[PDB]
Every structure is written in C-alpha cells, then in structure tokens.
Amino acid sequence: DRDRLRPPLDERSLRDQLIGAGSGWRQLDVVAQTGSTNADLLARAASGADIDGVVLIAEHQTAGRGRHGRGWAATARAQIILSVGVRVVDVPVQAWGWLSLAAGLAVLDSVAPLIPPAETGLKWPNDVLARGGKLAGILAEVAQPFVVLGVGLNVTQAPEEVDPDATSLLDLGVAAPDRNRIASRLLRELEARIIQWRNANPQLAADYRARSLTIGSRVRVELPGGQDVVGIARDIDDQGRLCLDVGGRTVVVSAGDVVHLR
Numbered sequence: 001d002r003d004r005l006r007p008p009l010d011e012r013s014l015r016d017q018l019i020g021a022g023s024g025w026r027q028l029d030v031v032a033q034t035g036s037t038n039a040d041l042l043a044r045a046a047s048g049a050d051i052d053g054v055v056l057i058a059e060h061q062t063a064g065r066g067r068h069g070r071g072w073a074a075t076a077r078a079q080i081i082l083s084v085g086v087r088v089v090d091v092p093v094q095a096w097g098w099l100s101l102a103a104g105l106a107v108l109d110s111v112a113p114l115i116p117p118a119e120t121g122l123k124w125p126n127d128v129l130a131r132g133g134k135l136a137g138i139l140a141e142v143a144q145p146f147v148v149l150g151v152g153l154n155v156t157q158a159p160e161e162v163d164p165d166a167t168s169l170l171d172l173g174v175a176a177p178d179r180n181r182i183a184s185r186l187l188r189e190l191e192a193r194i195i196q197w198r199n200a201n202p203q204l205a206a207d208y209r210a211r212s213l214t215i216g217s218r219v220r221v222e223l224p225g226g227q228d229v230v231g232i233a234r235d236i237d238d239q240g241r242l243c244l245d246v247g248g249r250t251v252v253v254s255a256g257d258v259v260h261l262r
Ligand SMILES: Nc1ncnc2c1ncn2[C@@H]1O[C@H](CNS(=O)(=O)NC(=O)CCCC[C@@H]2SC[C@@H]3NC(=O)N[C@@H]32)C[C@H]1O
Pocket: 035, 036, 037, 038, 039, 061, 063, 064, 065, 066, 067, 068, 070, 071, 072, 073, 074, 081, 082, 083, 134, 135, 136, 137, 138, 139, 150, 151, 152, 153, 154, 157, 162, 163, 165, 166, 167
C-alpha cells in the first residue's frame, strides 16, 4: 500500500546539505524510533547539553506529545518528525510566543508549492491546515535557556492511522512526496524564520498574517479549563496572542483551541 511510498531518510545527505558554512545547524541525527523527539532534546538540555542549532529526526515516534497534555500519533516513515533546539534567553520573554508562530509559517512555506484547495494556511496558534485538514502540528516547550520546537508533518500519513481531522501531502494530491527534499526545505525555511524572530523582523508578523486562516473568521475558542468563547478573530499582538472581537469587546487569548465557524 502506502508502505511503498515511504522510503527511509538519508541522514548522510541531510547532514551534507544542512551542516556547514552558511548554515546555522550544528548537529543532525536521524533515529529509527523514539518516544518523543521533544522529550529527547529536553533531556539533553537537562543534562547540560547545548542544544542550540541541534536537529533530531525520528522515522517513528511511539509516545508523541501534543499541546495541553494531549498526544500525537504516527506510523513509521509516514511523517517528518523532528525537534530543534533554540537559544532564547537573549530574547525578551514576551516575544517567545512568536517563535511558535514562526515555526508554523516555515512548515507551510516548505510544502506550499507542492500543494491549492480552499482553507490552506495557518490556524492559530500552530496548525498547518489544507483543505480543512490538519497537515502539521507544532509544539514548543521551554528548557532554559532553550526552547525546543517540535514539528509533526503528515507526508503520506493516512488520516485513518492517526486522526479523523488529519490530512497529508499524499491525500492532498502529491503522488510521490520526497521526505528528504521536504525535510531539507523545512529546516532551511525554519532557520530563516528563527533569525527573523530573534531580530524582531517585521516581515515575520506580516508573512504570518498573509497565510492566516483564522484572522477575519468567526471562531469558537476553547480555553484551558473548558470554557468556550465565540467571536471574530481580528489580529495577533506582539506576544503572539489572538485578539478576538466579542460583540465590540476585545478578548486577548494566550492559549486555546480554535474552531473556524460558519
Ligand atoms: N499525526 C497527526 N496528524 C494530525 N492530527 C493528529 C495527529 N496525531 C494526533 N492528532 C490529533 O491532534 C491533536 C493534537 N493537537 S495539538 O494539541 O494542537 N498538538 C499539536 O498539534 C502539536 C503536536 C506536536 C508533535 C510533534 S512531532 C515530534 C515532536 N515530539 C513530540 O512529542 N511532539 C512534537 C491530538 C489528536 O486528536
């Protein structure tokens, strides 16, 4: 079936392309299997390792982490599953939220040319959507002085294997997606967006708003704690928070699950 469309990654090739002069990535490893790539890089940092510019890719992930204590499902070689380490202590804590949004933007731009149906872009905070389905999910976790950015991108992953609301490049029409080429594109896009975030480049916010599916749409936001708030998304502030219009009132949300309404 789709197993024939899932060749292994080439670690040697990825290292040659992404490690060296002109690139900020210092280390890249491809593991056959792990519990969570995010947990692994957090564990390295917890033992005193400098994980800035360190890339960890897993062919398979058995205990993936989602946001708010949720999970992330995967089968072998069906996704691009990676985590990167980013030094953030040199940047004001108020702006750390934008690092998360920058990652989603990079993932989208890396695969966008391959895909162009309706509802294709970014859902606040870190959802890469295409044709209404979730193509990629991003998780950012703090381990001072670092932030670990995790990316789960469905390449050939069937929705029936992971989640009914999911989608993949293959299910979007991409017959033979090359994970080696896509992973390379993703990490080069990611490096650029991280640099932009670090230097507070205005283009980062401008580019995000251009790909936003949430801004200008009627939304139901499910807040931490179980409360729901219905309004219209208007903008993103300087902290990466979602600005909602609720009957003329402004409600700023730092975290929550967004559902685009009719
Ligand atoms: N395959 C999948 N593709 C679409 N959707 C899905 C899928 N596997 C479940 N789901 C569904 O999405 C839900 C998770 N939603 S979420 O709260 O916004 N969390 C996220 O999207 C962030 C996920 C980050 C995963 C990356 S991958 C490597 C790294 N390590 C790690 O443990 N996390 C990060 C749970 C499940 O209902």
